[PDB]
Write a structure and sequence with these properties.
The complex is a heterotetramer, with two copies of chain A (about 150 residues) and two copies of chain C (about 25 residues).
Chain A (H helix, E strand, L loop, with lengths): L2 E6 L1 H6 L1 E6 L7 E6 L8 E3 L3 E6 L6 E3 L2 E9 H6 L1 E6 L5 E6 L8 E4 L5 E2 L2 E5 L2 E8 L6 H10 L3
Chain C lengths: L3 E3 L1 H15 L5
The chains are: A mainly beta (about 150), C mainly alpha (about 25).
Function (chains C, D): Plays a role in neurogenesis and neuronal migration. Necessary for correct formation of mitotic spindles and chromosome separation during mitosis. Necessary for cytokinesis and cell proliferation.
Family (chains C, D): Belongs to the nudC family.
Organism (chains C, D): Homo sapiens
Amino acid sequence: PVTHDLRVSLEEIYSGCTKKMKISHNEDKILTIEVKKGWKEGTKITFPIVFVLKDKPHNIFKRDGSDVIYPARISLREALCGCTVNVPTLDGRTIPVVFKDVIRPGMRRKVPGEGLPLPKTPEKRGDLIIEFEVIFPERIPQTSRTVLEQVLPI
Amino acid sequence: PVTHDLRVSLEEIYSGCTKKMKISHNEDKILTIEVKKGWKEGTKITFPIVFVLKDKPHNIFKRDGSDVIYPARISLREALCGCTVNVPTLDGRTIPVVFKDVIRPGMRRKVPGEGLPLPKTPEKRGDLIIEFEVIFPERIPQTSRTVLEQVLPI
Amino acid sequence: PQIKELTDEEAERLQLEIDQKKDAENH
Amino acid sequence: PQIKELTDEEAERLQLEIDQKKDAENH
């Protein structure tokens, strides 16, 4: 009744992949493992041994079921005065997504259909969620404080 | 083997309280329930019936075990240019806590010993955690945007 | 089995009943 | 029971062994 962790990258989950696994008991044998589109953490593939699919951490995206989250690290200036976010896609395109209104700390903007394939309807994808991280200045001179007091509301 | 929820306010948990509970089976009988300082959600008091202590929501503080969290809703102006937070205490004092540096969205400042009594050492309290909520302006005129571009770093 | 919280005041008055009932049944 | 991931390349080479072993034991 034996489990071993099968680590799968976001890209593997987006497109599917085949994974080959070596064993010894004492004959060296190969178990092959089709990983179909959009399969979730925990998914069990058993072998008369139980491979349990784990999401490999990715540094651009955080998986949220079939959705994919994108941290957008912008300046406070960008957040107050406007900016363009070049959203990366899982297949390596970039989408400019223009923001005219004030962006708020932790604000989300759904980029529809740029997520993972939903396992059972893999022609239907989840979403890419922009998640804004507004980076404050470490320090503000007395010069700036005095202007900021005049132009920002009480 | 019967459970009934015993809702207890943050103030009751801070100072202790006695709670009286009416029953019928068919005699109306009273179970009394000393609630000692700092008792946590889930705490079971059984009666040959199992009262399970639940935290009543409070609108000023959010309980975090023996710690108490205080949302400080300040303006972006306050966060960039300095402010004084009048921290309320659980016994109704206010503590001014001055911030000179830039306050960051979701920043915490521990106010030591202003939390709940720790159950077994009730002379030793948990902490009050200030949790900052920085409120952005809904809108910024072109006038302000142009100044903000000049005084906030890229 | 019906349970419900009481005030300090409600609870006194209700004991004066289970008492002023265990009075009649102590006869 | 020792398990470990293989590359496409590692896996081929390792079958050529369990094969080029089931060759000797098929004698």
